[PDB]
């Protein structure tokens, strides 16, 4: 009982902090439990099925833990862990994007003169 999460998962290869670990665990568990949520949601919001099936599906969908919620996946700076002003094109926060662009790491980015 020395692991901070119910199910053991690997470690990100690069920058690692506690919030990155939380987000990664949520991402992975959502990946393995994304089919269940879609099926349960269809059953619980379908009118044609019996209302008892609908009720039980909705109850279980509500009872699902938080680490399988699509709403709790947040984008973070893969180089810093910062979760503000994150460009999805590079998975980098604003300042890390600036420094990597000026340093040449990004594949095709360049300063804007126009």
């Amino acid at each position: 009982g020395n692991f901070r999460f119910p199910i053991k998962t690997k470690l990100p290869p690069g920058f690692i902090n506690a919030r990155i670990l939380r987000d990664n665990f949520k991402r992975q568990q959502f990946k393995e439990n994304e089919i269940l949520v879609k099926s349960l949601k269809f059953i619980a919001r379908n009118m044609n099925l019996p209302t008892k099936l609908r009720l039980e599906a909705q109850l279980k969908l509500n009872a699902l833990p938080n680490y399988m919620r699509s709403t709790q996946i947040k984008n973070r700076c893969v180089d810093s862990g910062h979760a503000r002003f994150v460009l999805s094109d590079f998975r980098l926060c604003r300042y890390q994007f600036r420094e990597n662009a000026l340093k040449g790491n990004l594949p095709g980015v360049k300063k804007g003169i126009w």
Binding site: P13, G14, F30, E34, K38, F42, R45, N48, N75, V78
Partner: protein
């Protein structure tokens, strides 16, 4: 004026059967958009990289002849020993056997 609505509906039924499309005259909430959606789980999970990237630890099991050493970890160990000698350090953590 326009084509009979029954004729339009019949054409719709036939085309839907041919092309394998759902048909719903009444317009009830079938919730088919809940199912006909892509699984974004793989892409979402593969966000922080590949966890199996080679690490400095594995260089002993692979190429054991080369005697590598990492400045970062040596710096960490040197700082720890320096703290001990200077008198600072980390208090001993009491084991799990204490407390109720």
């Amino acid at each position: 004026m326009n084509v009979p609505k029954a004729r339009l509906l019949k054409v719709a039924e036939l085309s839907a059967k041919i092309f394998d499309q759902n048909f719903n005259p009444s317009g009830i909430r079938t919730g088919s958009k809940i199912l006909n959606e892509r699984l974004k789980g793989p892409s979402v999970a593969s966000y922080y990289g590949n966890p199996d990237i080679l690490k400095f630890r594995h260089l002993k099991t692979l190429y054991p002849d080369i005697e590598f050493v990492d400045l970062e970890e040596q710096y960490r160990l040197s700082m720890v020993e320096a703290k001990k000698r200077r008198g600072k350090g980390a208090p001993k953590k009491m084991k799990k056997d204490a407390a109720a």
